[PDB]
Design a protein around this ligand. Sequence first.
Ligand SMILES: Cc1n[nH]c(C)c1-c1cc(Cl)c(Nc2ccccc2C(=O)NO)c(Cl)c1
Ligand SMILES: O=C(O)CNC(=O)C(=O)O
Length: 424
Amino acid sequence: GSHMTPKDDEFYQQWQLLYPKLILREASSVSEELHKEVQEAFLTLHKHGCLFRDLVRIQGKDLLTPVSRILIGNPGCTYKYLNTRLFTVPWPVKGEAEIAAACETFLKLNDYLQIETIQALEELAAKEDEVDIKSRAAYNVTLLNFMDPQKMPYLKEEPYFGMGKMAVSWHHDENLVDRSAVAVYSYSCEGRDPDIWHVGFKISWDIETPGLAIPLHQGDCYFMLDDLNATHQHCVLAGSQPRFSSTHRVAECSTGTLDYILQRCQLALQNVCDDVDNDDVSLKSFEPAVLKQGEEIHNEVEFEWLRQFWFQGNRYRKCTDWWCQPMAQLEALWKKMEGVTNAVLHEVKREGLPVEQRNEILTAILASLTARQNLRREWHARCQSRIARTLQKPECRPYWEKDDASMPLPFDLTDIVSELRGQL
Ligand SMILES: Cc1n[nH]c(C)c1-c1cc(Cl)c(Nc2ccccc2C(=O)NO)c(Cl)c1
Ligand SMILES: O=C(O)CNC(=O)C(=O)O
């Protein structure tokens, strides 16, 4: 197993024949105006401490990420990677001061890279509607990254091609719009040179075709066009210096915007008599499908939104308070839904209800309350791991003790979920 750099004579033809949807636009092709601003914006965001390592999860194991990142993008948009939902620090489009300046820079960078990507995708088609090109370049977020490699005690070796040290292992960028492009601005402060940063590429499934290691110098950009991200894997090979990147994506956010999740809560609350907001929650229907939907939405807001947000110790507050009202509002909507689950439970215990209507209700809601119990343990335990204790550390929220009648239901549902089974 081997790899090719610009030192190898075969590099230039292997690029053209086995990695042609990869494009490089070097520092020289980007205006000096933009370089200074974009690099000052990285240094700005680093100074204020806006970039954090994430307490991610992979195959059961709780792991801290080598690199430090922040997500910037459209207001209300999220990007999920490695079971962790990141929330946009918003950039200004259609309606704390140094930080708003940096976000606007990365919007300016976003606009530039978009025109470069559309252009590059035109040229790819000429070789091989025009709305498809537009939507596959319509970047809604950028994930900024940072790693000082001298503050890692030992870096993993690249295992298939001898590319040396890896900052990020071989992967695909998850959760992107199908065939969408990715644009990356890179900024560093025998085989491949160990002191220089490279992006590595290989074909999926394949360690026989030699991989490419693309040297990245101060302000070089690369572009993964079309189905590249799916057919190929990439890695980041570490240099000796620290290095930033801004990686612009079209995040598949069909169930990942503030608007989308508010609307889902609005949908669950259609089954609640809504004259007044108090603890007397009563429901319009107990038709199985309506109750199932309500309980599924309760989980969605709790686990995809509330617990994902508060697991990040309010690292967002530091740079922006955009998500503060939204998340208070989502919690209150979730709290009402606790009221709903309580009201459904009340109804199944009613002397008066035919067992036949009771059993049809349980089959509607049990998978949802099952899944609420398991994920509550997973999230609670994940907030309590020895690694998490070491610290703005991860808050388990919402959480409440049994001796607390502000909440209609208990956090531990084992009593409750177990009782509903023995019947059915
Ligand atoms: C998936 C996906 N979608 N979008 C993105 C940004 C990713 C993504 C992000 C990261 Cl940060 C990592 N890396 C690691 C993560 C945890 C621990 C170690 C490493 C590492 O690789 N050290 O060896 C990989 Cl592999 C993928
Ligand atoms: O070059 C980069 O830093 C971008 N690549 C990645 O997979 C990443 O976002 O970590």
